[PDB]
Design a protein around this nucleic acid. Structure first.
Length: 150
DNA sequence: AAAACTATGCATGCTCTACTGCTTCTGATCTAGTCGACC
């Protein structure tokens, strides 16, 4: 949906943005949410989030992890911490339709292994790590973002 | 009493209108495969 009147995810989150924010760019991941369990349907069997069938009870959820512009302010060159803080003041999350990915501060390896073990326990792919001072470099790989899997 | 004209019933041919069977076109359904984009 390109307008609040008609869409599959936008008609519900039109009014989820604080009044001050008028121009806003966000980056995130789109996934499928099962409400009867209140759990995210892991990608794979029984559904594709690209061409979901209307009759299905599953719905679309947007998990945000970055902001690149708010009220004609260019946040590309700022540090990750600042972008996170500004992101916290964009929308009031409304579970099931738009959310912010939680990030935990960690400064030891035991924490990383604990997180990976817990992720495997919750049947997730893995865990990723972000450098607090990393800048957004479009199209580049392995600059401030790292991923870890079993 | 005999001959000529006319009426009516039936035979014959032709043409026109139902009803059954064969062939071909169209529509609806299923099954198999292809393309888009992502991960």
């Amino acid at each position: 949906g390109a307008s609040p009147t008609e869409g599959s995810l936008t008609p519900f989150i039109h009014n989820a943005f604080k009044a001050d924010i008028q121009i806003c760019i966000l980056d995130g991941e789109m996934m499928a949410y099962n409400p009867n369990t209140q759990t995210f349907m892991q990608k794979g069997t029984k559904f594709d989030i690209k061409r979901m069938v209307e009759d299905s009870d599953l719905q679309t959820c947007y998990c945000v992890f970055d902001v690149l512009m708010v009220n004609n302010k260019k946040l590309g060159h700022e540090t990750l911490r600042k972008r996170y803080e500004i992101l916290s003041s964009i929308f009031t999350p409304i579970p099931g339709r738009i959310e912010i990915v939680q990030k935990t501060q960690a400064h030891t390896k035991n924490e990383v292994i604990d997180a990976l073990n817990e992720a495997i326990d919750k049947r997730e792919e893995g865990i990723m790590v972000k450098q607090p001072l990393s800048i957004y470099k479009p199209d580049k790989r392995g600059e401030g973002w790292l991923k870890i899997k079993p």
